[PDB]
Amino acid sequence: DGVGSSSGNWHCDSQWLGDRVITTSTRTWALPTYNNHLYKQISNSTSGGSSNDNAYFGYSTPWGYFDFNRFHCHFSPRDWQRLINNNWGFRPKRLNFKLFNIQVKEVTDNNGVKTIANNLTSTVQVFTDSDYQLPYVLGSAHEGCLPPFPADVFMIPQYGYLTLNDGSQAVGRSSFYCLEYFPSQMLRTGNNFQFSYEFENVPFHSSYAHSQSLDRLMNPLIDQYLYYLSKTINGQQTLKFSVAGPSNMAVQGRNYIPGPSYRQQRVSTTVTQAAASEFAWPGASSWALNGRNSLMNPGPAMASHKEGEDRFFPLSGSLIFGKQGTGRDNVDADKVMITNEEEIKTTNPVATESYGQVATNHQSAQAQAQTGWVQNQGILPGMVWQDRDVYLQGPIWAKIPHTDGNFHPSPLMGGFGMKHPPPQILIKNTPVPADPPTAFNKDKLNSFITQYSTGQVSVEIEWELQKENSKRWNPEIQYTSNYYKSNNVEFAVNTEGVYSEPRPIGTRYLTRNL
Amino acid sequence: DGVGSSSGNWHCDSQWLGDRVITTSTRTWALPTYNNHLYKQISNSTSGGSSNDNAYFGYSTPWGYFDFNRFHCHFSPRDWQRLINNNWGFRPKRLNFKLFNIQV
Amino acid sequence: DGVGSSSGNWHCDSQWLGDRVITTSTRTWALPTYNNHLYKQISNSTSGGSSNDNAYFGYSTPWGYFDFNRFHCHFSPRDWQRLINNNWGFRPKRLNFKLFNIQV
Amino acid sequence: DGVGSSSGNWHCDSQWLGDRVITTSTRTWALPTYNNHLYKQISNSTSGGSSNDNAYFGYSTPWGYFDFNRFHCHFSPRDWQRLINNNWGFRPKRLNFKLFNIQVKEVTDNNGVKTIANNLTSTVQVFTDSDYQLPYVLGSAHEGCLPPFPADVFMIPQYGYLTLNDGSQAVGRSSFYCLEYFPSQMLRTGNNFQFSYEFENVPFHSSYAHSQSLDRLMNPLIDQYLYYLSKTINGQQTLKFSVAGPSNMAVQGRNYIPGPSYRQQRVSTTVTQAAASEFAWPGASSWALNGRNSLMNPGPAMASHKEGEDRFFPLSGSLIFGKQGTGRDNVDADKVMITNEEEIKTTNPVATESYGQVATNHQSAQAQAQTGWVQNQGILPGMVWQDRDVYLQGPIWAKIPHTDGNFHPSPLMGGFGMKHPPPQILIKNTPVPADPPTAFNKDKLNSFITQYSTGQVSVEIEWELQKENSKRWNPEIQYTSNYYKSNNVEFAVNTEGVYSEPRPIGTRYLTRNL
């Protein structure tokens, strides 16, 4: 429109209908100039790294991008509490995104002092990768998302991507992408940008915990009409059979079995434990691709620990969040928040235990029957399992890789897997050259006016709800704040205005039968 | 239009139809003041040259000009590869040119 | 039709449309008499083999069969090169089969 | 149709309308099996040749082809005489082609004796290269065309083609063509084949000889209003000028000049001439392509000899036809018929003479004026020329090479140049395998029944005529037979039934002004 007219209003609210909840969040963003308007080839050689498992090749772009792939970007703690305490499931339906109130500033430095002024004629470029023609980086748990607290002003992360690499070198199959080779809208201070997106059909997330275990689905009062091998010896091959009943539930015939497993090493959170060695990488569970070892993290959805063993967690089978103010490198256990998936112990195997035992020979009068531990078990017919729970500060969705085949493409870090997820939204400040020389020079200009941009961003997502119809008589487990006095209110600001999330919040508090 | 409204968008893409390919390219340009707004007579004497095969007379203008008479101004390397590997011939048909987002 | 009239023509060509390619191939075949018009029980004993991993039982028929389950039966090397250099994917859609010019 | 019904009639006649003549010719052909149904790579190594100018790479196909690219295939000598004596020009308009009365035979040899019988169920395959996707070999003066005498039965020539070569080896750019990769009609004894072709617009062939010379177009009674430099010296630079008039026609100003030239070495047909050396290749005029020397033959259309010098002919600037029964290698001059282009001496330069003289220096008081002979002269503005004449036994058309540029694409051997000439008509006997083994073998069959095919071929061509409207008073030169007694009639059969063409017949007997 014009310089003196706002191009949008501040929309931040949650609307709770019967089977739907609509979340709207608005944030103020700041966008600097990245790479000084240049594309730069990057690799482990340019970052000084030399281990082959950490080798890479790719490019850093002068473009930024908008990321809102975390639940706390849309749900307040109270809204999250309502969702998890009142619904058996939820899933995103549609998306509305807006950019408005664009403000481009120029920075001039004379001597140790910088002056900031408006550049009303400068432009900012925005486009969406609706055709998914660029590498998708929103499927990784990267920082730079919209802040959970609406009052926080955030910096737009720089967009970068990786391609095929051989050590620090590239190959002929490696691809280079120029983001200026895409049509993009150019916005001055009076312009705004908006688009709508429809989520593809995805299953409802399981925001419930099973009230029954897979091995306890039988009637505890009635025998089965099936027999099991009880005895074998007299005290001669004396085969004896008995009815499987309530007194021996472990040997009863069952129609379904627990889901797959990929065993994790076990770590205790108890201080004054002596470790026998440094094992964080040597003892790690891991998968190899083209000679590169990657850590299995978080791996298949498995129960974090057995009943009563909350002190143990899988070495890399659980999401680890950092508390507010936590450092980047080598922080203590009390500075991080270790999530656990104990709710899925009713259907999924324990992460730090073998799946089971399998016969490994033919027993005879000369050879005793032998069994072997199954540390990793693939998918078998009749298996049932629960996917990893999602969290308030955890990811929402991920892009299913474009491959010939996949099985249960639920993101392993939690969330909804989609072939066509919300498109990447890329933003960049248009370069503004400084005064050029009065004589023609064919070289590309390298002198630009120092600029940055700021504005507001709004994203609205409609969520579909799956209401609970339980006939359970006794009250359910519910997420609740603790009344006991404390120096600060949980999920609030401190005396210095710092917002903090004191604990990870799952979704599985209500119960339903298996 | 106005100071605070963009006068055009960034269009840079290639569209491949059956018998036609449409190339669009957008660039950012900078234009200084040439000759301090003056027209100047130029010659090999003003550039100090004295061989007769290199002798000339003419004028330098304060005007600039836009030139896109090179194939890489319109075709990306991948588009060029497609064109050369899949076609026995090609020729230009029509042109569209735009100047926008003027900043003085 | 008749003895002196051909029952079909030689069709062997590839037609490249926008999103579709139609491949046609014609070959000359010869069919002898198999097993002297008999069905015969066959096994690893009749072929003299005695390893259990290679043991088998079955039948050999006096019938022949037409097989075109290889890509080079339909795509020339140039057509294959075009397909692989210009397309992200392909799949068969429909089939037409003909036998003609029978000569016994 | 059926075995016992003819699929076509014998059509061989010429119909003379006002401005059009329609020629129809029917011939009986025989088609054997070529290369034993195989494609074979051929090169100068496979033929034992080692000179680099003669090096080649290509393929021989089992297909034959029909060729009617000679005028005597359509015009009888009397029709040719009428055409050349009554018309100033002619050009082909449209084409009709027919194959019918197909007869396929099988040959069986027991012991030194062969038995031939009909194979009523066998097929012959015919198709036309209407899209010009195969190498065009009809543009060369090859043998194998339809015989001039309708009663002669001819053998179908085998189709072969050449591609890019480096010595006897091929390169990556070389192309291999499979003629079975084309849709073709399969014909039994009851079937027939036919198609129609329309000639693209071509200029009328010049079937006239100019009655004026390019240097004698002025009025012989009136002076020009232009002056020429007559004198220079006194006997001091004394420049003298004179009017160019009838007394000095050589110095008169002229608007047009003779056409281009590429000088030929001169050879005398007179016996008992002593040659100074072997010069047939060392003295030859020639052009080089990629390091290979090719003879300039017949080269640009130039006058064969000056007036009264019929004994001389250019070394390779004239078409040479062989008399009936003439051998293939090293025959005497009396066994060949040397064509001449003396009719174009009025506009074209003499083949064995320089185009002219050009100044080569600046004359002065110290240096005498110098001139140099122009042995080769390219196209200049104002040039006019006549193309090479066509002959009864000479070629009719040729395919203009598909190139970015060309100038006056009239075939240098004579005829009409076309981007889309009459398409190649390719024919092959369908292989008929012998008895295969009773056990499956994956190798391609190499045992086939010995077969050949025979039938009739008809081609009808409509020619457009350009009538003469001359006001010449005295009678014209006309082609005529000689009444004087001879043992045989010219253009007739001998006592052994051998048809012969005793002389080449041009088309340029009538006259018109320049």
UniProtKB/TrEMBL annotation, chains A, D:
<keyword id="KW-0946">Virion</keyword>
<feature type="binding site">
    <location>
        <position position="343"/>
    </location>
    <ligand>
        <name>Ca(2+) 2</name>
    </ligand>
</feature>
<feature type="binding site">
    <location>
        <position position="248"/>
    </location>
    <ligand>
        <name>beta-D-galactose</name>
    </ligand>
</feature>
<keyword id="KW-0167">Capsid protein</keyword>
<dbReference type="GO" id="GO:0039615">
    <property type="term" value="C:T=1 icosahedral viral capsid"/>
</dbReference>
<comment type="similarity">
    <text>Belongs to the parvoviridae capsid protein family.</text>
</comment>
<protein>
    <submittedName>
        <fullName>Capsid protein VP1</fullName>
    </submittedName>
</protein>
<dbReference type="GO" id="GO:0005198">
    <property type="term" value="F:structural molecule activity"/>
</dbReference>
<feature type="binding site">
    <location>
        <position position="340"/>
    </location>
    <ligand>
        <name>Ca(2+) 1</name>
    </ligand>
</feature>
<feature type="binding site">
    <location>
        <position position="343"/>
    </location>
    <ligand>
        <name>Ca(2+) 1</name>
    </ligand>
</feature>
<feature type="binding site">
    <location>
        <position position="281"/>
    </location>
    <ligand>
        <name>beta-D-galactose</name>
    </ligand>
</feature>
<keyword id="KW-1140">T=1 icosahedral capsid protein</keyword>
<feature type="domain" description="Coat protein VP1/VP2 Parvovirus">
    <location>
        <begin position="1"/>
        <end position="486"/>
    </location>
</feature>
<keyword id="KW-0479">Metal-binding</keyword>
<keyword id="KW-0106">Calcium</keyword>
From TrEMBL, chains B, C:
<protein>
    <submittedName>
        <fullName>Capsid protein VP1</fullName>
    </submittedName>
</protein>
<comment type="similarity">
    <text>Belongs to the parvoviridae capsid protein family.</text>
</comment>
